[PDB]
């Protein structure tokens, strides 16, 4: 999506997460900014030695190479053939006999 999302300074509004107590479960969301404790030390406040902000951004710029460039993603997830259907593809029904 480089021509849609990229900017020659870096579109810094996109954040990923670098740290986590544990690998999150399938389809889990985690809204947090609480500082990651890389040292054995406890670490309060906004920053600290070996105390890392748990997010970092992408700098998205058109001047980068392929692979660096921003990708949009959609994951279409669905469940099938086991419950009352609420979505269908464009097949018309026939009569019933």
């Amino acid at each position: 999506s480089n021509n849609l999302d990229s900017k020659v300074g870096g579109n810094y509004n996109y954040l990923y997460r670098l740290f986590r107590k544990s690998n999150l479960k399938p389809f889990e969301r985690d809204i947090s900014t609480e500082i990651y404790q890389a040292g054995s030390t406890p670490c309060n406040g906004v920053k600290g030695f070996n105390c890392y902000f748990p997010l970092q951004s992408y700098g998205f710029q058109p001047t980068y190479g392929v692979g660096y460039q921003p990708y949009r993603v959609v994951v279409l997830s669905f469940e099938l053939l086991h419950a009352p259907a609420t979505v269908c593809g464009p097949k018309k029904s026939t009569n019933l006999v």
Binding site: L15, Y16, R17, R29, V74, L80, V87, C88, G89, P90
Partner: protein, 49 residues
């Protein structure tokens, strides 16, 4: 879902719910704009069926 002006950030990945509607997945599958379209429990051709 595919032309919306800003997407969300991954750490706060948006979820939209879909129901009570008709789904022409040939729209998604045919467009060259998409680099990858990998399906993990259906063939992409079968989505319309």
């Amino acid at each position: 879902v595919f032309n919306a002006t800003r997407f969300a950030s991954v750490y706060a990945w948006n979820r939209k719910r879909i129901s009570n509607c008709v789904a022409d997945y040939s729209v998604l599958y045919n467009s060259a704009s998409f680099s990858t379209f990998k399906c993990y429990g259906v063939s992409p051709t079968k989505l319309n069926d």
